[PDB]
Every structure is written in C-alpha cells, then in structure tokens.
Structure 1
Amino acid sequence: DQLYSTLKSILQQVKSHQSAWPFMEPVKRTEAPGYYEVIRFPMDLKTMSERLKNRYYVSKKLFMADLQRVFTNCKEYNPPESEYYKCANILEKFFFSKIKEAGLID
C-alpha cells in the first residue's frame, strides 16, 4: 500500500534522527518512577512501529495523533529547559518537515 510505504519511510527517518533517542522505547519505571500515574496515554516510536506493522494507521489523522502524543507527553511531564523537552521540539520540526516533503494529506 502506498500509504503504508510513505508512513514507514517517515517513521524510519524520525527514528534515525539524533534527537529521537529519548522516545525510541517506552519510559521505564526505573527511569521515571511514578511516570505512569501522570501520563494516562503513553506512546513511543517502538509502539508506533509495531502499530504500523499491524496495519493500524489507515489514515494520516492517526499517525499524526500518535506521534504528537509522544511530544505532548514529554512537554507535560518535563520542564521546558530539560534535554527531553528540547529534543521534542527539534524532532517535532523535523517531523513536520518530513510530512510536507511527502505531501501526506487526508
């Protein structure tokens, strides 16, 4: 499917970005105790990859929602001057640029 091919490319490019390291896998309780009592809807790029392979992203408004949740979770949990917050904004920019290059639209 062409939609699948585009999203996989976009996601793979996001996963390769230098600023994607805080979001590759789910937050661990060891890394942030009590995280999962504040962030009701966790999301990460591994979870997104599996969701892509399982064919859950039948639309753009969907792939966007999951990836945006990653950023909003980080901005809600962390302060603006932490490296996690900084990484979210850098990666968000890159993401939106990649969305434009592909002309991905609803």
Structure 2
Amino acid sequence: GSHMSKEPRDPDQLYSTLKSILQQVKSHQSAWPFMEPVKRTEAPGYYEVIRFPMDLKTMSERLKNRYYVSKKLFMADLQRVFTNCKEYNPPESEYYKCANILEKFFFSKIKEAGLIDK
C-alpha cells in the first residue's frame, strides 16, 4: 500500500536493531556518561533521585546475549539513560549536553525504525 514506517519486524530483526542503535548511540561521542560505568557518589545527586539507575554499559551487556529484544523494554531503559543524566545533572553541564545530543540522535534513529513505545 503506502509507506508509513512505524512498526518493527519480528523479534529477530528488532533484536539486532536495538543492538545496532546501541552500537551507534554508545559509539557516539555523546555517550560517555552512559557507555562507561559510573561510581556510586561521583554524580552530583544520585541514588536519592534516580528510581532506576541505568547506563549503556548495562544494555549492551544483556542485549549482547539476549534481553532487550522488545521495543518498549529497550526504549524504556535507553530513554531512562538520557533522562537519568538530565535528572541529577543541572541545566548547565556537559553531562546534559552529550545526553541531549545523543538522545536526539536516538529518537531520530528509532523514529525511522518504527520503534518507540514508552
């Protein structure tokens, strides 16, 4: 019929698809606040604000073997990464910058892969 691009294709393609998005999002210069692991009190205001701390170092870990195969599961965590930084980081900081730049890249990429869910 026509072209709308707004629906994943089976868990097989979607699986590696999330693995590709992470490969780019993580490889993106604006991913160091999530790619590498963070300390425990190195973040200005952590634990007592982030209900579910998350980072890219954990996604690729499970996504590698078999975990983020769904569209909402991956989007939830990944989206939790961009907001988590934006959460404990003030309005003026490099953490938010790279998090807002990569987050923009993420939404666009998924917007084209008919992903996104919650």
Tell me the TM-score range normalised by the shorter chain: 0.7 to 0.9
Per-residue CA deviation, residues 78-100 of structure 1 (Å, 9 max, x unaligned), is 10111101111111100011112
Superposition map of 1:78-93 within 5 A: 78-93=89-104
CA contact (8 A) 1:26 1:43 kept: no
Q: Does 1:56 align with 2:50?
A: no
* 2-structure distance, mates of 1:73, 1:84: 10
Q: Is the 8 A contact 2:44 2:88 kept in 1?
A: no
Q: CA 1:105–1:70 in 2, change beyond 3 Å: closer, same or farther? A: closer
Which range is displaced more, 20-29 or 59-68? 20-29
- The 8 Å contact of residues 80 and 86 in structure 1, kept in 2 or not, is answered as no
Which structure has more RCO (C-alpha within 8 Å, separation ≥ 6)? Answer: 2
Q: Is the 8 A contact 2:75 2:116 kept in 1?
A: no
Q: Where does structure 2 lack aligned partners over 5 or more consecutive residues?
A: 1-11
Q: CA deviation at 1:7?
A: 1.0
Say if 1:85 and 1:105 are closer, same or farther in 2 by CA, change over 3 A: closer
Look at both structures and tell me which one has the larger radius of gyration over its CA atoms.
2
The answer (yes or no) to whether the contact 1:26–1:42 under 8 Å persists in 2 is: no
Quote how far apart the aligned CAs of 1:101 are: 3.1
* Preserved CA contact (<8 Å) 2:22 2:60: yes
SS in 2 for 1:27: coil
Length, aligned pairs only: 106
Q: How much does 1:30 deviate?
A: 5.5
Query: For the residues of structure 2 that align with 1:105 and 1:68, how far apart are their CA atoms?
Result: 10
Tell me the distance in 1 between the aligned counterparts of 2:81 and 2:14: 21
| Cα distance in structure 2, aligned partners of 1:18 and 1:33 | 22
CA deviations on 1:18-60 (whole Å, 9 max, x unpaired) are 1111111332025237623432311010100112124222310
Unmatched 5+ stretches in structure 1? none
Structure having the higher helix fraction is 1
TM-score by length of 2: 0.78
